[PDB]
Amino acid sequence: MNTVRSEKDSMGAIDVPADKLWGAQTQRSLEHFRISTEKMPTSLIHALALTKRAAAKVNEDLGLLSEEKASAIRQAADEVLAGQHDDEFPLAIWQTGSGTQSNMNMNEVLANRASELLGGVRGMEAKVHPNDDVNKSQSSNDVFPTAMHVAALLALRKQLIPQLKTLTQTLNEKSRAFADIVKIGRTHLQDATPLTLGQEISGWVAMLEHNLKHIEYSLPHVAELALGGTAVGTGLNTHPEYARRVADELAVITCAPFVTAPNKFEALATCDALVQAHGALKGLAASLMKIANDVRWLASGPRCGIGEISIPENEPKVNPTQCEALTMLCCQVMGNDVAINMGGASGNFELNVFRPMVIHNFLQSVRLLADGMESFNKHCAVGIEPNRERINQLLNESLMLVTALNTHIGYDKAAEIAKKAHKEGLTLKAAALALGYLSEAEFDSWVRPEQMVG
């Protein structure tokens, strides 16, 4: 639409697109921060809407906001949560470091929509005010960190943790199914003493189980909310019960264990909970990178690599493309951790103003890890299968089973056999027969890989 609606603030008049619900502050931000393409993610927009919905409810309970306005604001917020207003949030990540401009974006959109819900219009004549009504009892300084933690905790609980549990279950099933398949070990990339494919996969399972615990340990701190600290942490001008009531209301409407932060100065001056929680996510990235690499190396071939397992072929030579997407996003999480650490280390005095960047990286890492585990699970892990003949060919051509001979012929003769096999390019069996130290039936009876794995 070309038509505009004129709005005015202390700097003068500014035109806003007539078909949009935002106002003068959003327009000024969008015009002054034309930096790259990254915007607030939907998860954060929704968390801001939840925050305003909870504040409106508490302000009504406390007699500070009328029933008619509070109900209209909550209904507008529910429309945002239902996906009806995604194009009303145009602002860049690369904005004011407190997130003030996105706070005001939500205030303006909810106020103008609430006005319409009460039979009014958008703009200067609206029936609901962005600051006096939608932002009542609030500061950008406590709202934005609250929305950051709401988005982070819900994404961890609802997306990442369920996908981690699902992938863990799949690999545990595979570990049990392949518990009796002996294969060659590899240490330093060199052939080593055997273990079962089930045992090797059980290591991946144990990694994912440990990662789940580390992530779970990070959740209580992310559940602490800044809301009620207002501008500098003192809560100046708020009702004494407001901070607890709004955390309680957020806990009710999200079904997640939000609590008010015990120290609002820590809550405003730092992003420490997210620095710590992201530490657990970069741990998960290091574990997934290792699992993904084992899978693609074990499946390498079809003739000039390892080839011990097969994986689903999802494209019409076929490459381990799910493993590649996963290893790439694991690198991304490691970079994101550095950006988060720099922002988290850079607070000054009463406020950390690196917040849009910190939450952009944090929520990206959660999407990448959650969706990457989901994709790797359904398009790779559920279909891993052993190549039993290839596994046995490698085991039987290795030199590593020679220790099974020690109890029968002694260490010196076993070592002589292995040295001859290596020097002359023979199997252990062929070298042993060539020296006359045993018969083929003896070799087959004594060299039992299933007895060498514990």
Choosing from 48, 325, 381, 384, the residue that interacts with its own copies (CB under 8 A) is: 325
2 is an interface residue for its own copies by CB under 8 A: no
Query: Residue 70 Cβ, how far from its own copies at the closest point, in Å?
Result: 23
CB 329 within 8 A of CB 375: no
62 is an interface residue for its own copies by CB under 8 A: no
Q: Which residues contact 172 (CB under 8 A, 6 or more apart)?
A: 202, 205
User: How far, in Å, are 39, 274, 341 from residue 346 at the CA level?
Assistant: 22, 14, 9
Q: Give the x-and-dash track for 330-369 against its own copies (CB under 8 A).
A: xxx-xxxxxxxxxxxxxxxxxxxxx-xx---x--x--xx-
The interface region with its own copies, picked from 72-80, 109-117, 121-129, 297-305 by CB under 8 A, is 297-305
Q: Which of 365, 376, 401, 207 is nearest to 287 (CA)?
A: 207
Q: Which residues contact 194 (CB under 8 A, 6 or more apart)?
A: 182, 183, 184, 185, 395, 400, 401, 449, 452, 453
DSSP, collapsed to helix, strand or coil, labels residue 64 as coil
392 is an interface residue for its own copies by CB under 8 A: no
DSSP state of 237: T
Residues 401-430 that bind its own copies (CB under 8 A): 402-403, 406, 411, 414-415, 418-419, 422-423, 425
Give first-to-last CA distance, the chain, whole Å. 73
How far apart (Å, rounded) are the C-alpha atoms in residues 159 and 366? 8
Choosing from 1, 119, 315, 436, the residue that interacts with its own copies (CB under 8 A) is: 315
Residues 197-216 that bind its own copies (CB under 8 A): 199-200, 202-203, 205-207, 210-211, 213-214
Q: Give the x-and-dash track for 100-139 against its own copies (CB under 8 A).
A: xx--------------------------------------
Query: Residue 66 Cβ, how far from its own copies at the closest point, in Å?
Result: 21
273 is an interface residue for its own copies by CB under 8 A: yes
Question: Which H or E run contains 404?
Answer: none
Q: Which two tokens stand for residue 127?
A: 């029936």
Q: Give the x-and-dash track for 160-199 against its own copies (CB under 8 A).
A: ------------------------xxxxxxxxxxxx---x
Residues 425-444 that bind its own copies (CB under 8 A): 425
